[PDB]
Design a protein around this ligand. Structure first.
Ligand SMILES: NC(=[NH2+])c1cc2cccnc2s1
Ligand SMILES: [Ca+2]
Ligand SMILES: [Mg+2]
Length: 223
């Protein structure tokens, strides 16, 4: 997250860190046994870490659970990143408490102009690399689809939306992939891609979760 702030320990209780010996992607807890992340974060051997704030210090509120199965969307295209969403089932159910909570799925899609909260442990520099140990947050609005499409011609599909600031300065970045975009208490997006980070006229692109609620509900009920 570039141009963001320190969230504060466990202020984003649904945020998860996917670890394969090191943190490589974020995700969101949707219920005690399931996590949603980005399909491009797929790896074999994932351990999900819940209740984290500093990912390099065991502070007492973490739950480390291995994944039993991962399901990448049937139509994920790694070349275009269309349908960049995946579900991860935990080996054991997590224990929900104040610090570990799940986030709700949307009933409808959010409108351009809606402010959201984006969080992650990704890079904090636009031209440079500095990875933080604690969770960073960024409040950003959903942008109109025309500003999204003019920034990325021929690359935006109806399963993606842009959020951020066209002036640059504030944005999600590498290491934030798979993490949450929560607007009005619902999970509306997943950090997916972009061009550099916090550059002018290159906002971040997010998977549009409201288009996958049926697939999510159906898949978790049958697995
Ligand atoms: N919001 C951005 N500028 C992002 C760029 C990338 C690049 C790779 C992975 N994730 C992201 S997010
Ligand atoms: Ca920790
Ligand atoms: Mg994240």
């Amino acid at each position: 997250i570039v141009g963001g702030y320190t969230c504060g320990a466990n202020t984003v209780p649904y945020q998860v860190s996917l670890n394969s010996g090191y943190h490589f992607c974020g995700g969101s807890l949707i219920n005690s046994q399931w996590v949603v992340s980005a399909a491009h974060c797929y790896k074999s051997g994932i351990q999900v870490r819940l209740g984290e704030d500093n990912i390099n210090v065991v502070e007492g509120n973490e739950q480390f659970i291995s994944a039993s199965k991962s399901i990448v969307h049937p139509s994920y295209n790694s070349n275009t990143l269309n349908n960049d969403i995946m579900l991860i089932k935990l080996k054991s159910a997590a224990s929900l408490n104040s610090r570990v909570a799940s986030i709700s799925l949307p009933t409808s899609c959010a409108s351009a102009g809606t402010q959201c909260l984006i969080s992650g442990w990704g890079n904090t520099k636009s031209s440079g690399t500095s990875y933080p140990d604690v969770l960073k947050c960024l409040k950003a609005p959903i942008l109109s689809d025309s500003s999204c499409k003019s920034a990325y011609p021929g690359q935006i599909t109806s399963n993606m939306f842009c959020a951020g600031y066209l002036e640059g300065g504030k944005d999600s970045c590498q290491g934030d992939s798979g993490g949450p975009v929560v607007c009005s208490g619902k999970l509306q997006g997943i950090v997916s891609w972009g061009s550099g980070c916090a550059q002018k006229n290159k906002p971040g692109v997010y998977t549009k979760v409201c288009n996958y609620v049926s697939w999510i509900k159906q898949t978790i009920a049958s697995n």
